[PDB]
Amino acid sequence: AKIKVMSIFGTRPEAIKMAPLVLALEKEPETFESTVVITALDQVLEIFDIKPDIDLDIMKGQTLAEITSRVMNGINEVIAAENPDIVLVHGDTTTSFAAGLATFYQQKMLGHVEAGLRTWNKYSPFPEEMNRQLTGVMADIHFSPTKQAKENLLAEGKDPATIFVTGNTAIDALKTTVQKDYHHPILENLGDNRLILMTAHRRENLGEPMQGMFEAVREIVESREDTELVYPMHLNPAVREKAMAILGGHERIHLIEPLDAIDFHNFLRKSYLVFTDSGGVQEEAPGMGVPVLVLRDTTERPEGIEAGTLKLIGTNKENLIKEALDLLDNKESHDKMAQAANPYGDGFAANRILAAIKSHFEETDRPEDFIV
């Protein structure tokens, strides 16, 4: 008798974060039976060589109430038939909550991957904060990405024996998304130059601060000739216009279209430093040992800052330049961040998750938390 694990994912980012876990399950077929259920990303599954078992075509002018009901009724039926021992839902999407609820209705064990993040504000993010809180009450086992997420769960009175700080599976994903010898002209023509990668997608930054930020990187590039800038341009025309105006026409600045999360991981790997306001990049970049300068005034990632893998520098042009130059001119400061321990995971969150599941069903050694 195997432990039948049903992994549910409904978005591309979930696919990337759940794939590694599915791979881990598939590495131990003597113990696990893996059932993958899609509720939407076929490019990601091809990379991880994951044949999905069930594909629910849930639809897209649908309200939140309708999406929830469709996914819940769909998953209810899938679970009732497949009769898995455990269903794994991820993070805070509506699909995860709905599938979680169908899992509870079917009286199956519910595992929550990336468990316990909280803003404690029921309407920000909406409905993600509530999703993760609801999923949190229904979950039987929680796989927290950090010590903080675990504490959040403890403060809500969850049973410590059911929470495991495993790290973030997104980092495990890098072992597969990052190619042995990735292919891209810019990376091939890079030579001895230091690649600087920049991305900004937060509404607050895409506004007026955007101009100061492009001017900052332009100046970094002009001041340091052995650097090159890659900027996947945001789709907003006003943003592109500012990018073309300030960053256009420079041989060492590449203004390209938005990269896939996968192409991005591969660029990230050869990057010397990255400027971003993306949450995922703050946890993934240090997985590559890439120093991250965060273009934000606030952050939900204090661990990265305390660890030294990340630097919160805001959006002031003078601060972008200073902080960038510091890293570019002082190899000591670079390796300091480059070697700082990633508090969000070591790339083996999947293994800890599986050991945790094995621990419950076969009552084998309880895995200890990921040590930051």
mmCIF file of C-alpha atoms in Angstrom:
data_model
loop_
_atom_site.group_PDB
_atom_site.id
_atom_site.type_symbol
_atom_site.label_atom_id
_atom_site.label_comp_id
_atom_site.label_asym_id
_atom_site.label_seq_id
_atom_site.Cartn_x
_atom_site.Cartn_y
_atom_site.Cartn_z
ATOM 1 C CA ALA A 1 0.000 0.000 0.000
ATOM 2 C CA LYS A 2 1.392 3.354 -1.094
ATOM 3 C CA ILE A 3 0.714 6.815 0.249
ATOM 4 C CA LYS A 4 -1.442 8.309 -2.496
ATOM 5 C CA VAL A 5 -0.686 12.022 -2.706
ATOM 6 C CA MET A 6 -2.834 14.289 -4.831
ATOM 7 C CA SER A 7 -1.087 17.546 -5.686
ATOM 8 C CA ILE A 8 -3.309 20.318 -6.880
ATOM 9 C CA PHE A 9 -2.096 23.337 -8.806
ATOM 10 C CA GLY A 10 -3.999 25.963 -10.759
ATOM 11 C CA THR A 11 -1.529 28.645 -11.886
ATOM 12 C CA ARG A 12 1.898 28.774 -13.521
ATOM 13 C CA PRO A 13 3.626 30.008 -10.334
ATOM 14 C CA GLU A 14 1.966 27.206 -8.319
ATOM 15 C CA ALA A 15 3.093 24.772 -11.009
ATOM 16 C CA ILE A 16 6.695 25.859 -10.576
ATOM 17 C CA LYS A 17 6.496 25.643 -6.768
ATOM 18 C CA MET A 18 4.611 22.291 -6.721
ATOM 19 C CA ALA A 19 6.524 20.548 -9.549
ATOM 20 C CA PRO A 20 9.635 19.915 -7.374
ATOM 21 C CA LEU A 21 7.429 18.296 -4.759
ATOM 22 C CA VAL A 22 5.836 16.130 -7.446
ATOM 23 C CA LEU A 23 9.341 15.177 -8.665
ATOM 24 C CA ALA A 24 10.353 14.241 -5.104
ATOM 25 C CA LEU A 25 7.270 11.993 -4.831
ATOM 26 C CA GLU A 26 8.142 10.413 -8.152
ATOM 27 C CA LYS A 27 11.700 9.675 -6.899
ATOM 28 C CA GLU A 28 10.184 7.405 -4.251
ATOM 29 C CA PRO A 29 7.548 5.312 -6.074
ATOM 30 C CA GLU A 30 7.976 2.416 -3.614
ATOM 31 C CA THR A 31 6.295 4.675 -1.049
ATOM 32 C CA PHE A 32 4.204 7.191 -2.969
ATOM 33 C CA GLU A 33 1.589 7.243 -5.662
ATOM 34 C CA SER A 34 1.468 10.726 -7.230
ATOM 35 C CA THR A 35 -1.787 12.083 -8.688
ATOM 36 C CA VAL A 36 -1.470 15.505 -10.282
ATOM 37 C CA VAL A 37 -4.648 17.492 -10.724
ATOM 38 C CA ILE A 38 -4.711 20.704 -12.745
ATOM 39 C CA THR A 39 -7.295 23.431 -12.133
ATOM 40 C CA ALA A 40 -6.081 26.334 -14.306
ATOM 41 C CA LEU A 41 1.196 25.962 -17.667
ATOM 42 C CA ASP A 42 1.954 22.925 -19.858
ATOM 43 C CA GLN A 43 5.402 24.409 -20.548
ATOM 44 C CA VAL A 44 6.349 24.052 -16.864
ATOM 45 C CA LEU A 45 5.113 20.468 -16.681
ATOM 46 C CA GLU A 46 7.195 19.571 -19.734
ATOM 47 C CA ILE A 47 10.328 20.953 -18.019
ATOM 48 C CA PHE A 48 9.702 18.818 -14.918
ATOM 49 C CA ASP A 49 8.467 15.936 -17.120
ATOM 50 C CA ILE A 50 5.163 15.782 -15.257
ATOM 51 C CA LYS A 51 2.215 14.105 -16.872
ATOM 52 C CA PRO A 52 -0.880 15.576 -15.204
ATOM 53 C CA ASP A 53 -3.406 12.883 -14.187
ATOM 54 C CA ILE A 54 -6.575 14.996 -14.114
ATOM 55 C CA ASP A 55 -7.224 18.283 -15.901
ATOM 56 C CA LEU A 56 -10.306 20.246 -14.854
ATOM 57 C CA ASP A 57 -11.219 22.974 -17.308
ATOM 58 C CA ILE A 58 -12.559 25.552 -14.832
ATOM 59 C CA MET A 59 -13.358 28.937 -16.382
ATOM 60 C CA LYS A 60 -13.154 33.759 -17.753
ATOM 61 C CA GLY A 61 -15.656 36.424 -16.652
ATOM 62 C CA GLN A 62 -16.436 34.455 -13.510
ATOM 63 C CA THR A 63 -16.929 35.895 -10.049
ATOM 64 C CA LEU A 64 -14.945 34.783 -7.055
ATOM 65 C CA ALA A 65 -17.970 32.909 -5.730
ATOM 66 C CA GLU A 66 -18.295 30.988 -8.993
ATOM 67 C CA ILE A 67 -14.626 30.103 -9.300
ATOM 68 C CA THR A 68 -14.710 28.792 -5.739
ATOM 69 C CA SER A 69 -17.832 26.715 -6.270
ATOM 70 C CA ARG A 70 -16.572 25.266 -9.600
ATOM 71 C CA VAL A 71 -13.207 24.256 -8.148
ATOM 72 C CA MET A 72 -14.740 22.915 -4.932
ATOM 73 C CA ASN A 73 -17.350 20.797 -6.718
ATOM 74 C CA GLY A 74 -14.766 19.694 -9.280
ATOM 75 C CA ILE A 75 -12.182 18.711 -6.676
ATOM 76 C CA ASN A 76 -14.859 17.146 -4.458
ATOM 77 C CA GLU A 77 -15.632 14.751 -7.319
ATOM 78 C CA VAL A 78 -11.976 14.102 -8.176
ATOM 79 C CA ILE A 79 -11.121 13.333 -4.545
ATOM 80 C CA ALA A 80 -14.187 11.119 -3.989
ATOM 81 C CA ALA A 81 -13.192 8.981 -6.978
ATOM 82 C CA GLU A 82 -9.369 8.911 -6.644
ATOM 83 C CA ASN A 83 -9.563 8.502 -2.830
ATOM 84 C CA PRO A 84 -6.109 9.866 -2.085
ATOM 85 C CA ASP A 85 -4.598 9.607 1.359
ATOM 86 C CA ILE A 86 -3.564 13.226 1.249
ATOM 87 C CA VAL A 87 -4.187 16.247 -0.852
ATOM 88 C CA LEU A 88 -1.600 18.989 -1.161
ATOM 89 C CA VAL A 89 -2.690 22.522 -1.903
ATOM 90 C CA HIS A 90 -0.355 25.427 -2.253
ATOM 91 C CA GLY A 91 -0.225 28.890 -0.802
ATOM 92 C CA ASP A 92 -3.063 31.349 -0.976
ATOM 93 C CA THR A 93 -4.887 31.020 -4.275
ATOM 94 C CA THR A 94 -8.618 30.556 -4.407
ATOM 95 C CA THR A 95 -8.104 27.202 -6.097
ATOM 96 C CA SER A 96 -6.057 25.964 -3.128
ATOM 97 C CA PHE A 97 -8.627 27.032 -0.589
ATOM 98 C CA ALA A 98 -11.470 25.514 -2.577
ATOM 99 C CA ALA A 99 -9.621 22.257 -3.114
ATOM 100 C CA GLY A 100 -8.746 22.304 0.571
ATOM 101 C CA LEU A 101 -12.361 22.601 1.510
ATOM 102 C CA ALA A 102 -13.343 19.742 -0.848
ATOM 103 C CA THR A 103 -10.520 17.760 0.812
ATOM 104 C CA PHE A 104 -12.093 18.419 4.227
ATOM 105 C CA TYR A 105 -15.564 17.553 2.974
ATOM 106 C CA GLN A 106 -14.088 14.286 1.711
ATOM 107 C CA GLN A 107 -12.420 13.745 5.075
ATOM 108 C CA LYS A 108 -8.941 13.397 3.529
ATOM 109 C CA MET A 109 -5.773 14.635 5.097
ATOM 110 C CA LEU A 110 -4.884 18.133 3.884
ATOM 111 C CA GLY A 111 -1.311 19.295 3.499
ATOM 112 C CA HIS A 112 -0.583 22.989 2.965
ATOM 113 C CA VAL A 113 2.581 23.815 1.029
ATOM 114 C CA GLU A 114 3.867 27.332 1.812
ATOM 115 C CA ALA A 115 1.817 27.508 4.997
ATOM 116 C CA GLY A 116 1.387 30.408 7.346
ATOM 117 C CA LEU A 117 2.212 33.677 5.569
ATOM 118 C CA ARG A 118 0.191 36.501 7.099
ATOM 119 C CA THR A 119 -0.394 40.221 6.782
ATOM 120 C CA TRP A 120 -3.228 39.836 9.343
ATOM 121 C CA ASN A 121 -5.238 42.165 7.083
ATOM 122 C CA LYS A 122 -8.256 40.254 5.761
ATOM 123 C CA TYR A 123 -8.519 42.617 2.749
ATOM 124 C CA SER A 124 -4.838 42.986 1.743
ATOM 125 C CA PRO A 125 -4.021 40.930 -0.128
ATOM 126 C CA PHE A 126 -7.558 39.978 -1.137
ATOM 127 C CA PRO A 127 -8.553 37.204 -1.178
ATOM 128 C CA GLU A 128 -5.129 35.679 -0.587
ATOM 129 C CA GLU A 129 -4.768 36.548 3.119
ATOM 130 C CA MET A 130 -8.161 35.001 3.855
ATOM 131 C CA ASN A 131 -7.381 32.083 1.565
ATOM 132 C CA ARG A 132 -4.273 31.148 3.501
ATOM 133 C CA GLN A 133 -6.017 31.660 6.824
ATOM 134 C CA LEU A 134 -8.971 29.443 5.832
ATOM 135 C CA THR A 135 -6.676 26.836 4.327
ATOM 136 C CA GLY A 136 -4.717 27.112 7.567
ATOM 137 C CA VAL A 137 -7.659 26.031 9.716
ATOM 138 C CA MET A 138 -8.525 23.126 7.411
ATOM 139 C CA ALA A 139 -4.955 21.893 7.015
ATOM 140 C CA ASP A 140 -3.788 18.863 8.950
ATOM 141 C CA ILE A 141 -0.133 19.466 8.146
ATOM 142 C CA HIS A 142 1.617 22.737 7.407
ATOM 143 C CA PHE A 143 4.788 23.164 5.475
ATOM 144 C CA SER A 144 5.948 26.667 6.361
ATOM 145 C CA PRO A 145 8.590 28.336 4.291
ATOM 146 C CA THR A 146 10.049 30.181 7.277
ATOM 147 C CA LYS A 147 10.302 30.268 11.035
ATOM 148 C CA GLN A 148 8.028 33.348 10.933
ATOM 149 C CA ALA A 149 5.278 31.524 9.064
ATOM 150 C CA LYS A 150 5.486 28.779 11.692
ATOM 151 C CA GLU A 151 5.153 31.289 14.528
ATOM 152 C CA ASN A 152 2.119 32.825 12.793
ATOM 153 C CA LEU A 153 0.513 29.412 12.823
ATOM 154 C CA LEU A 154 1.475 28.886 16.466
ATOM 155 C CA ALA A 155 -0.066 32.252 17.451
ATOM 156 C CA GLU A 156 -3.362 30.995 15.966
ATOM 157 C CA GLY A 157 -3.137 27.947 18.250
ATOM 158 C CA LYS A 158 -2.064 25.322 15.685
ATOM 159 C CA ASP A 159 -0.530 22.099 16.990
ATOM 160 C CA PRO A 160 3.292 22.472 16.848
ATOM 161 C CA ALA A 161 3.575 18.764 15.938
ATOM 162 C CA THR A 162 1.746 19.534 12.668
ATOM 163 C CA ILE A 163 3.963 22.420 11.431
ATOM 164 C CA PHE A 164 7.233 21.969 9.568
ATOM 165 C CA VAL A 165 9.543 24.794 8.495
ATOM 166 C CA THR A 166 10.680 23.274 5.230
ATOM 167 C CA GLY A 167 11.871 26.299 3.261
ATOM 168 C CA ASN A 168 10.362 27.426 -0.050
ATOM 169 C CA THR A 169 9.899 24.872 -2.891
ATOM 170 C CA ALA A 170 10.496 27.702 -5.427
ATOM 171 C CA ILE A 171 14.182 27.364 -4.641
ATOM 172 C CA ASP A 172 13.996 23.573 -5.292
ATOM 173 C CA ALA A 173 12.529 24.490 -8.694
ATOM 174 C CA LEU A 174 15.790 26.225 -9.695
ATOM 175 C CA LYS A 175 17.536 22.837 -9.809
ATOM 176 C CA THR A 176 15.303 22.019 -12.788
ATOM 177 C CA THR A 177 14.489 25.383 -14.432
ATOM 178 C CA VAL A 178 18.138 26.484 -14.574
ATOM 179 C CA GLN A 179 19.663 24.738 -17.561
ATOM 180 C CA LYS A 180 23.131 23.188 -17.732
ATOM 181 C CA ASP A 181 24.103 25.467 -20.616
ATOM 182 C CA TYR A 182 21.375 28.057 -21.221
ATOM 183 C CA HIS A 183 21.130 29.780 -24.607
ATOM 184 C CA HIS A 184 20.678 33.547 -25.177
ATOM 185 C CA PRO A 185 22.608 36.061 -27.401
ATOM 186 C CA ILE A 186 22.970 38.672 -24.638
ATOM 187 C CA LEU A 187 24.312 36.086 -22.241
ATOM 188 C CA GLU A 188 26.571 34.739 -25.012
ATOM 189 C CA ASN A 189 27.835 38.210 -25.961
ATOM 190 C CA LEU A 190 28.220 39.120 -22.284
ATOM 191 C CA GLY A 191 31.945 38.247 -22.211
ATOM 192 C CA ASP A 192 33.674 39.496 -19.051
ATOM 193 C CA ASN A 193 30.892 42.033 -18.319
ATOM 194 C CA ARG A 194 28.822 41.976 -15.167
ATOM 195 C CA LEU A 195 25.154 41.432 -15.843
ATOM 196 C CA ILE A 196 22.717 43.634 -13.959
ATOM 197 C CA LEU A 197 19.110 42.506 -14.163
ATOM 198 C CA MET A 198 16.185 44.783 -13.310
ATOM 199 C CA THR A 199 12.438 44.194 -12.882
ATOM 200 C CA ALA A 200 9.701 46.303 -11.371
ATOM 201 C CA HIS A 201 6.042 45.280 -11.366
ATOM 202 C CA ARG A 202 4.599 46.922 -8.217
ATOM 203 C CA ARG A 203 1.973 49.540 -8.893
ATOM 204 C CA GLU A 204 3.653 52.003 -6.492
ATOM 205 C CA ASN A 205 6.965 51.846 -8.403
ATOM 206 C CA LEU A 206 5.552 51.769 -11.941
ATOM 207 C CA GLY A 207 4.284 55.266 -11.236
ATOM 208 C CA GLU A 208 6.415 58.414 -11.081
ATOM 209 C CA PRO A 209 9.391 56.760 -9.340
ATOM 210 C CA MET A 210 10.037 54.727 -12.473
ATOM 211 C CA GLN A 211 11.806 57.637 -14.174
ATOM 212 C CA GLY A 212 14.266 58.143 -11.310
ATOM 213 C CA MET A 213 14.967 54.411 -11.257
ATOM 214 C CA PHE A 214 15.768 54.116 -15.008
ATOM 215 C CA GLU A 215 17.947 57.221 -14.814
ATOM 216 C CA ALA A 216 19.743 55.536 -11.909
ATOM 217 C CA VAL A 217 20.608 52.333 -13.796
ATOM 218 C CA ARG A 218 21.496 54.316 -16.936
ATOM 219 C CA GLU A 219 24.031 56.193 -14.819
ATOM 220 C CA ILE A 220 25.316 52.948 -13.232
ATOM 221 C CA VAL A 221 25.880 51.538 -16.723
ATOM 222 C CA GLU A 222 27.628 54.703 -17.995
ATOM 223 C CA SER A 223 29.817 54.957 -14.878
ATOM 224 C CA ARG A 224 30.903 51.298 -15.000
ATOM 225 C CA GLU A 225 31.845 50.117 -18.491
ATOM 226 C CA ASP A 226 32.228 46.455 -17.566
ATOM 227 C CA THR A 227 28.496 46.170 -16.775
ATOM 228 C CA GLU A 228 25.473 45.358 -18.882
ATOM 229 C CA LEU A 229 21.823 45.903 -18.024
ATOM 230 C CA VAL A 230 18.972 43.644 -19.016
ATOM 231 C CA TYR A 231 15.510 45.059 -18.510
ATOM 232 C CA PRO A 232 12.513 42.990 -19.510
ATOM 233 C CA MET A 233 10.197 45.892 -20.237
ATOM 234 C CA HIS A 234 6.870 46.048 -18.449
ATOM 235 C CA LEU A 235 3.900 45.891 -20.821
ATOM 236 C CA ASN A 236 2.632 49.359 -19.759
ATOM 237 C CA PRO A 237 3.225 51.737 -22.709
ATOM 238 C CA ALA A 238 3.983 54.733 -20.443
ATOM 239 C CA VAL A 239 6.630 52.617 -18.693
ATOM 240 C CA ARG A 240 8.163 51.461 -21.992
ATOM 241 C CA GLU A 241 8.221 54.985 -23.339
ATOM 242 C CA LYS A 242 10.233 56.058 -20.269
ATOM 243 C CA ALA A 243 12.497 53.035 -20.688
ATOM 244 C CA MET A 244 13.165 53.708 -24.389
ATOM 245 C CA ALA A 245 13.723 57.396 -23.715
ATOM 246 C CA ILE A 246 16.202 56.852 -20.894
ATOM 247 C CA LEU A 247 17.629 53.391 -21.484
ATOM 248 C CA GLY A 248 17.368 53.189 -25.266
ATOM 249 C CA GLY A 249 20.268 53.403 -27.677
ATOM 250 C CA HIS A 250 22.993 52.054 -25.390
ATOM 251 C CA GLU A 251 25.061 49.054 -26.470
ATOM 252 C CA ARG A 252 25.306 47.770 -22.868
ATOM 253 C CA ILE A 253 21.611 48.138 -22.020
ATOM 254 C CA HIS A 254 19.212 45.503 -23.336
ATOM 255 C CA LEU A 255 15.534 46.385 -23.400
ATOM 256 C CA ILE A 256 13.751 43.155 -24.038
ATOM 257 C CA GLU A 257 10.237 41.809 -23.717
ATOM 258 C CA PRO A 258 9.066 40.243 -20.438
ATOM 259 C CA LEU A 259 10.873 36.974 -19.804
ATOM 260 C CA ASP A 260 9.222 33.764 -18.704
ATOM 261 C CA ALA A 261 9.879 32.874 -15.067
ATOM 262 C CA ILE A 262 12.092 30.101 -16.499
ATOM 263 C CA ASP A 263 14.147 32.265 -18.875
ATOM 264 C CA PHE A 264 14.395 34.650 -15.974
ATOM 265 C CA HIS A 265 15.888 32.028 -13.648
ATOM 266 C CA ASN A 266 18.518 31.374 -16.324
ATOM 267 C CA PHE A 267 19.351 35.097 -16.649
ATOM 268 C CA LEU A 268 19.346 35.371 -12.921
ATOM 269 C CA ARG A 269 21.988 32.630 -12.724
ATOM 270 C CA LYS A 270 24.519 34.646 -14.756
ATOM 271 C CA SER A 271 23.575 37.943 -13.080
ATOM 272 C CA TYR A 272 25.989 39.847 -10.849
ATOM 273 C CA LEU A 273 23.171 41.655 -9.084
ATOM 274 C CA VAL A 274 19.460 42.209 -9.477
ATOM 275 C CA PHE A 275 17.170 45.133 -8.747
ATOM 276 C CA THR A 276 13.610 44.084 -8.128
ATOM 277 C CA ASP A 277 10.409 44.696 -6.289
ATOM 278 C CA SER A 278 9.320 41.064 -6.862
ATOM 279 C CA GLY A 279 8.759 38.787 -3.869
ATOM 280 C CA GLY A 280 9.694 35.620 -5.733
ATOM 281 C CA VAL A 281 13.009 37.062 -6.922
ATOM 282 C CA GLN A 282 13.989 37.973 -3.346
ATOM 283 C CA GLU A 283 13.727 34.317 -2.408
ATOM 284 C CA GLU A 284 15.039 32.771 -5.635
ATOM 285 C CA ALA A 285 17.946 35.056 -6.524
ATOM 286 C CA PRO A 286 19.841 34.276 -3.310
ATOM 287 C CA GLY A 287 19.260 30.609 -4.222
ATOM 288 C CA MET A 288 21.583 31.412 -7.157
ATOM 289 C CA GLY A 289 23.809 33.446 -4.828
ATOM 290 C CA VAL A 290 22.776 36.667 -6.611
ATOM 291 C CA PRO A 291 22.754 39.789 -4.425
ATOM 292 C CA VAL A 292 19.363 41.504 -4.529
ATOM 293 C CA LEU A 293 18.685 45.265 -4.225
ATOM 294 C CA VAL A 294 14.983 45.637 -3.392
ATOM 295 C CA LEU A 295 13.180 48.588 -4.992
ATOM 296 C CA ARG A 296 10.720 49.072 -2.133
ATOM 297 C CA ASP A 297 10.072 51.218 0.926
ATOM 298 C CA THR A 298 8.583 48.284 2.812
ATOM 299 C CA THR A 299 8.772 44.506 2.567
ATOM 300 C CA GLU A 300 7.157 41.265 3.658
ATOM 301 C CA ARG A 301 10.625 39.603 3.403
ATOM 302 C CA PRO A 302 12.410 40.779 6.541
ATOM 303 C CA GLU A 303 14.360 37.468 6.784
ATOM 304 C CA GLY A 304 16.285 38.202 3.584
ATOM 305 C CA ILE A 305 17.266 41.599 4.958
ATOM 306 C CA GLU A 306 18.367 40.208 8.319
ATOM 307 C CA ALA A 307 20.286 37.395 6.571
ATOM 308 C CA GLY A 308 22.057 39.800 4.218
ATOM 309 C CA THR A 309 20.949 38.155 0.975
ATOM 310 C CA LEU A 310 18.760 41.211 0.279
ATOM 311 C CA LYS A 311 19.029 44.982 0.657
ATOM 312 C CA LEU A 312 15.954 47.174 0.996
ATOM 313 C CA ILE A 313 17.003 50.364 -0.788
ATOM 314 C CA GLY A 314 13.752 52.011 -1.852
ATOM 315 C CA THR A 315 13.389 53.827 -5.146
ATOM 316 C CA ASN A 316 15.473 56.995 -4.725
ATOM 317 C CA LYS A 317 17.844 57.353 -7.728
ATOM 318 C CA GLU A 318 20.815 58.318 -5.536
ATOM 319 C CA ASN A 319 20.307 55.262 -3.346
ATOM 320 C CA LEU A 320 20.073 52.923 -6.390
ATOM 321 C CA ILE A 321 23.429 54.215 -7.723
ATOM 322 C CA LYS A 322 25.255 54.217 -4.389
ATOM 323 C CA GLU A 323 24.126 50.764 -3.417
ATOM 324 C CA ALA A 324 24.771 49.379 -6.897
ATOM 325 C CA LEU A 325 28.273 50.874 -7.127
ATOM 326 C CA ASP A 326 29.063 49.549 -3.642
ATOM 327 C CA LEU A 327 28.374 46.000 -4.834
ATOM 328 C CA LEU A 328 30.095 46.523 -8.176
ATOM 329 C CA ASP A 329 33.292 48.110 -6.719
ATOM 330 C CA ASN A 330 33.672 46.041 -3.560
ATOM 331 C CA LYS A 331 34.033 42.313 -4.238
ATOM 332 C CA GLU A 332 33.978 41.812 -0.435
ATOM 333 C CA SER A 333 30.450 43.282 -0.187
ATOM 334 C CA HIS A 334 29.335 41.177 -3.111
ATOM 335 C CA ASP A 335 30.544 37.811 -1.817
ATOM 336 C CA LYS A 336 29.189 38.798 1.605
ATOM 337 C CA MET A 337 25.707 38.800 0.086
ATOM 338 C CA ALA A 338 26.569 36.090 -2.447
ATOM 339 C CA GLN A 339 27.498 33.649 0.325
ATOM 340 C CA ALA A 340 24.908 34.745 2.935
ATOM 341 C CA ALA A 341 22.570 31.854 3.828
ATOM 342 C CA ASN A 342 19.233 32.048 2.016
ATOM 343 C CA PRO A 343 16.677 32.153 4.817
ATOM 344 C CA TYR A 344 13.885 31.103 2.445
ATOM 345 C CA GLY A 345 15.342 27.680 1.610
ATOM 346 C CA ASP A 346 18.315 25.581 0.509
ATOM 347 C CA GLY A 347 16.487 23.852 -2.370
ATOM 348 C CA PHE A 348 15.409 20.775 -0.449
ATOM 349 C CA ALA A 349 12.035 21.881 0.848
ATOM 350 C CA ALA A 350 10.433 19.066 -1.176
ATOM 351 C CA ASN A 351 12.483 16.397 0.604
ATOM 352 C CA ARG A 352 11.544 17.782 4.010
ATOM 353 C CA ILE A 353 7.889 17.930 2.931
ATOM 354 C CA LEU A 354 7.935 14.254 1.855
ATOM 355 C CA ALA A 355 9.771 13.133 4.995
ATOM 356 C CA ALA A 356 7.114 15.029 6.920
ATOM 357 C CA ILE A 357 4.345 13.154 5.059
ATOM 358 C CA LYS A 358 6.201 9.818 5.464
ATOM 359 C CA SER A 359 6.586 10.650 9.157
ATOM 360 C CA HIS A 360 2.821 10.797 9.562
ATOM 361 C CA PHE A 361 1.832 7.726 7.525
ATOM 362 C CA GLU A 362 4.695 5.321 8.202
ATOM 363 C CA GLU A 363 5.558 6.911 11.549
ATOM 364 C CA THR A 364 9.227 7.150 10.588
ATOM 365 C CA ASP A 365 11.659 9.791 11.893
ATOM 366 C CA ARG A 366 10.089 13.253 12.153
ATOM 367 C CA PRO A 367 12.060 15.616 9.937
ATOM 368 C CA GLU A 368 13.569 18.561 11.775
ATOM 369 C CA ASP A 369 12.949 22.150 10.622
ATOM 370 C CA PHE A 370 15.047 23.889 7.995
ATOM 371 C CA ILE A 371 17.797 25.669 9.933
ATOM 372 C CA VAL A 372 18.299 29.326 8.935
#
